[PDB]
Structure 1
C-alpha cells in the first residue's frame, strides 16, 4: 500500500502492429492500470480474474493501444500508493523503413566511437536507435530527414512528434565490426583489364575459419566465405566479378573463428589498379654484359609511369615522369641485364588525380641478354 509497484510489458514495450503483448503490474493484488492523457477503453474489458494478478493481456496490438501507461494499487487503509514508473507502449509499422548507415566506416577496432546516422525520405521530427543483440531486450535512445548517433545489431525507427508512440517500420539490421592480421594476395597481378576477372586469396596462420573483404571507402562487405584451420593457417578466395572503372582502390581483409564473432586486425593494404582508362597510349622502347636502360614515354600528361614484368610482377616500379621532346617519359635503369631479369616487360602511365587508374599497357618488350 505504501510502495509503488513495477509496470512492464511482455515480451516488450515496442511491438509490431498486430502482434500480441501483455502488460503486467506487480506490487498486493488489487491493481489499477491507466493511460496518462487519454483514457484507454480496452482496459475496462479485461476480466477481473486477470486484473487481480496484474495481467493485462492485449491479444493483438493496434494503434489505439500505444501510449504512456501507469499503474497504482492499495486500498482501504492508507490506500493509494505512488504510480508505477511510466511504460511507453509503442506500436511499429506506421511508416516506411529508414536507412541506417555507419559513418565513415562500419569497421572500428576496439574501445572507439562510431557515428551511426538514420536517413529517411519523409520529414520526421524524431528518430531512435534501438540496439538489438541477444535475449537481453534491446535498449533505445532518442535523437530534417537525418539523425546522428554516436556510440551487436543496430536498427533505427522514425516517428512524428504528434504521435510519439507510433514509430515507423524498423530499419534493416546493421552489424558493426585485434588478432594476428591476415594476408592479402591477388593473382595474376594488381593490374587488371576492364572485362577481366580478379580474385583475392586471404588467409592467416592464426586459425580462422570465415574471411571477409572490405574495400576502403564502401558501405558494406564485398564478399564472405569460410575455411578450415588445423593448427596453422586458413585461406578464403574472394571473387570480384567483371571489373570496371569503379573497382580500383585499396583492399583489406579480415578473418574470424568458428563460433566467436570478434574479428582480427586489418590486413595490409592491397592496391588494385585498373588499366585502359585513358586513350593516349604509352611506348616502351630501349635506349641502346650490357648496361642498358629502357624508356617509357607517352604523349598525354602522365604524372607517374609504372613498370611491370611478366612473371615477377606484384612488383610495380612507379617513377615520376618528366617533360622531354614535347612528350612525357620516364627512364628505368636496368643496368646489366643478367639471366635473372631476362623478361618480357610492360609499362603503364598514370595521373596523380586518378591514382588507382592506369592507361592501356605498352606493347611487350622482349628483353633478353
Structure 2
C-alpha cells in the first residue's frame, strides 16, 4: 500500500505552450494511477503499465501548458478489484513562467569562476516587489530552490548559499520571482549565469 513517487520531464519550471509528462512509479503492481492537483476537483486516471521490471507506472502528459496548470501535484495507486487506494506521493510543484510583472537579475559572489571548496553565494535581485525568489539550474531540472525575498531598499533579494561548492554545482542558473497570490506563477527569467568550477 506504500506511496508511489512522482517526477517531471523535462522539468517543473514551464513556459506557456510547453508540454510535460508527470510520471508516477510504484513497486506495488497497481492496476491504475490517479494524478491530482492540490485543491482542484478534476482528476486524471491512467492504467498501469510495466515497462521497467518489478515496477508499475503511468505517464501523465499535460497538454500545451497554461497559467491554470500551475500548482501542487500528487499521485496515488489503486487496484482493480480492491477498494483501497495507496498513500499519496510526495507533492510535485509545477511552475508557470512569464505570468507576473518584473524581471530579476542574477549575480555571483565573489565570481563565476570558482575554485572547488569555496564559499559561493548566488543572489537574485529585483526592483519590483517579489515575495519569493526561485533558483533554477538548466536541465536536468529537478529543483528548484525557493526563498522568501528580503526587502533591502531599494531592492528585493535572496541569497542562495552554496558554501562548500563542488564540481556538481557548476552549470547554468536562472532566477525567478513570485508573489503570494499564486506561488506557482513566476516572473520572466533573469539572464542565465554560467557557474564554472576548477
How high is the TM-score relative to the length of structure 2?
0.86
Provide the secondary structure at the position in 2 that maps to 1:340: helix
The 3 A distance-change label for structure 1 pair 322 and 230 is closer
More strand by share: 2
Q: Where do 1:126-275 residues align within 5 Å?
A: 179-228=1-50, 232-275=54-97
Q: Which has the higher contact order (CA 8 A, sep 6+)?
A: 2
User: Separation in 2 of the partners of 1:234 and 1:343?
Assistant: 33
> Which of residues 100, 106, 111 in structure 2 aligns to 1:284?
106
Q: How does 1:330-341 map to 2 (within 5 A)?
A: 330-341=158-169
Matched, 1:313 2:141: yes
Classify the secondary structure of the residue corresponding to 1:355. strand
Q: Please give the root-mean-square deviation of Cα atoms over the aligned residues, in Å.
A: 2.1
In the alignment, which residue of structure 1 is the partner of 2:156? 328
Aligned position for 1:304: 132
Q: How does 1:68-79 map to 2 (within 5 A)?
A: none
Structure 2 portions without partners, runs of 5+: none
Q: Any idea what SS the aligned residue of 1:301 has?
A: coil
Contact kept, 8 Å, 1:247 with 1:274, in 2: the verdict is yes
Do the aligned residues in 2 keep the contact of 1:209 with 1:228 (CA within 8 Å)?
no
- Is the 8 Å Cα contact of residues 48 and 56 (structure 2) preserved in structure 1? no
Shift in Å at residue 197 of structure 1?
0.7
Deviations 1:303-340 (A, max 9, x none): 11111212453222212212234111112223354322
The structure 2 residue matched to 1:359, chosen from 179, 187, 194, is 187
Gaps in structure 1 of 5+ consecutive residues: 1-178
Residue 237 to residue 323, structure 1, CA distance change in 2 (3 Å): same
Q: Is the CA contact 2:97–2:187 (under 8 Å) kept in the aligned structure 1?
A: yes
Change in Cα spacing, 1:335 to 1:257, as seen in structure 2 (3 Å) is same
Aligned to 1:121: none
Structure 1 residues 229 and 259, CA gap change in structure 2 (3 angstroms): farther
- TM-score, length of structure 1 as denominator length: 0.48
Inter-CA distance 183–283: structure 2 relative to 1 (3 Å threshold): same
Q: How does 1:53-92 map to 2 (within 5 A)?
A: none
> How far apart, in 1, do the equivalents of 2:95 and 2:78 lie?
28
Change beyond 3 A, Cα 1:283–1:231: closer
**Counterpart-to-counterpart distance in 1, 2:5 and 2:136:** 22
**CA–CA distance in 1 between the matches of 2:135 and 2:28?**
35
CA contact (8 A) 1:344 1:365 kept: yes
**CA–CA distance in structure 2, aligned partners of residues 262 and 181 of structure 1:** 13
Q: 1:262-298 CA deviation, whole Å, 9 max, x = no partner?
A: 3222222111111111121111122323533222111
1:90 alignment partner in structure 2: none
Deviations 1:193-230, CA, capped at 9 Å, x for gaps:
11111110012001112212111222231342332489
